[PDB]
Scaffold this motif. Structure first.
Motif, short mmCIF file in Angstrom:
data_model
loop_
_atom_site.label_atom_id
_atom_site.label_comp_id
_atom_site.label_asym_id
_atom_site.label_seq_id
_atom_site.Cartn_x
_atom_site.Cartn_y
_atom_site.Cartn_z
N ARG A 141 0.82 -1.21 0.00
CA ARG A 141 0.00 0.00 0.00
C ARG A 141 0.86 1.26 0.00
N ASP A 142 1.81 1.35 0.94
CA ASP A 142 2.64 2.54 1.05
C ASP A 142 3.59 2.67 -0.13
N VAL A 145 2.00 4.02 -3.60
CA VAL A 145 1.79 5.46 -3.58
C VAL A 145 3.10 6.20 -3.81
N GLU A 146 4.14 5.84 -3.04
CA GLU A 146 5.43 6.50 -3.14
C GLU A 146 6.03 6.34 -4.54
N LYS A 149 4.40 8.90 -6.78
CA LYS A 149 4.81 10.24 -6.34
C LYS A 149 6.24 10.56 -6.77
N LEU A 180 -5.06 2.67 -5.73
CA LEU A 180 -3.98 3.39 -5.09
C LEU A 180 -3.12 4.21 -6.05
N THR A 181 -3.21 3.96 -7.36
CA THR A 181 -2.32 4.63 -8.30
C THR A 181 -3.03 4.88 -9.63
#
Length: 237
Positions: A141-142, A145-146, A149, A180-181
Motif C-alpha cells: 500500500r505505502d 503510492v510513493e 509520487k 492506489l495509483t
C-alpha cells in the motif's frame, strides 16, 4: 489500450531460441511489448545487457523493456540510449526511491517501470527485493503510492505466490493496488489459460505479462486477443 506483453528471462545472452529471434517472432504474432529480464553473472552483466539491447533494437519495432540488476542511473541511461524504451527497477528503486525521479527526469516517466514483487505476509501485502529473497517490511500500500509520487510511469506487479504456478493471476492484489495509483499496471505471474487474462483486466490491470505460457505455446496471442476482444476487452488487433 490493453497490451499483451511477453517476458523473456535471459542469461548470458540466451533465454533461460536466442532472445532476438524469439522477440522477433513475438513482434509478428501480435505481442504489443516485450520485457527482457537478465540474470547474468554480475561481472559480464553490464556488457551482456548492452549487447542484448543492441541486437533487439536492430530488428524489433515494438516497445521493449529491459531490467534486472539495474542499480543506478548510468546503467539505466546507457541501456536506454543503446535502444531500450523502458527500464524496470525493483531493488535499487526500493533502497533508493530517488532513482525513480532521476531516470524519469532525463527519459520521462514513461521510461521508468518499477517492478514490484509482493507477497502476503501475516495478512498484509509486503514488498520484496533481491528477487523475493528479502521482505522489506514495507507495505505494498505505502510503496505503490510513493512509487507514483516519485515519478514512475508504470508498475510491473508480480505476485510471488502465484508466479509460475499457471493457476491464475492475483486479482485480489491487482484490485488492492488498482485504487492506489494512476499508472498503468502490468500484472505478471499466474496466467495459465486465456480466462486468467480476462480476470486480470477486470481486476484493473492495464497490461498482462506472461513468460512460460507463451513460450511453451499453451496460449496463442492472436487467439488470446480474439478472445478478450470478444468479451469486451479493448485490445489492439
Amino acid at each position: 489500450a490493453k497490451r499483451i506483453i511477453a517476458c523473456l528471462d535471459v542469461k548470458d545472452g540466451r533465454v533461460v531460441g536466442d532472445p532476438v529471434e524469439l522477440g522477433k517472432f513475438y513482434s509478428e504474432i501480435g505481442i504489443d511489448e516485450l520485457v527482457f529480464l537478465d540474470i547474468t553473472a554480475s561481472v559480464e552483466k553490464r556488457k551482456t545487457m548492452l549487447e542484448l539491447v543492441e541486437k533487439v533494437a536492430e530488428q524489433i519495432d515494438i516497445p521493449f523493456t529491459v531490467g534486472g540488476g539495474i542499480h543506478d542511473f548510468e546503467t539505466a541511461s546507457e541501456l536506454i540510449l543503446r535502444g531500450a524504451d523502458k527500464v524496470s527497477i525493483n531493488t535499487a528503486a526500493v533502497e533508493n526511491p530517488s532513482l525513480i525521479t532521476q531516470i524519469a527526469q532525463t527519459f520521462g516517466s514513461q521510461a521508468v517501470v518499477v517492478a514490484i514483487d509482493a507477497k502476503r505476509v501475516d495478512g498484509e501485502f509486503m514488498v520484496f527485493t533481491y528477487s523475493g529473497k528479502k521482505n522489506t517490511g514495507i507495505l505494498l500500500r505505502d510503496w505503490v503510492v510513493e512509487v507514483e509520487k516519485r515519478g514512475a510511469g508504470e508498475i510491473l506487479l508480480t505476485s510471488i505466490d502465484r508466479d509460475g504456478t499457471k493457476s491464475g493471476a492475483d486479482t485480489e492484489m491487482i484490485r488492492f493496488v488498482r485504487p492506489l495509483t494512476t499508472l498503468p499496471i502490468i500484472a505478471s505471474g499466474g496466467a495459465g489459460k486465456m480466462e486468467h487474462f480476462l480476470e486480470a483486466f477486470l481486476a484493473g490491470a492495464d497490461a498482462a505479462l506472461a513468460a512460460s505460457v507463451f513460450h511453451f505455446r499453451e496460449i496463442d496471442v492472436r487467439e488470446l486477443k480474439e478472445y478478450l476482444k470478444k468479451h469486451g476487452v479493448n485490445v489492439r488487433l
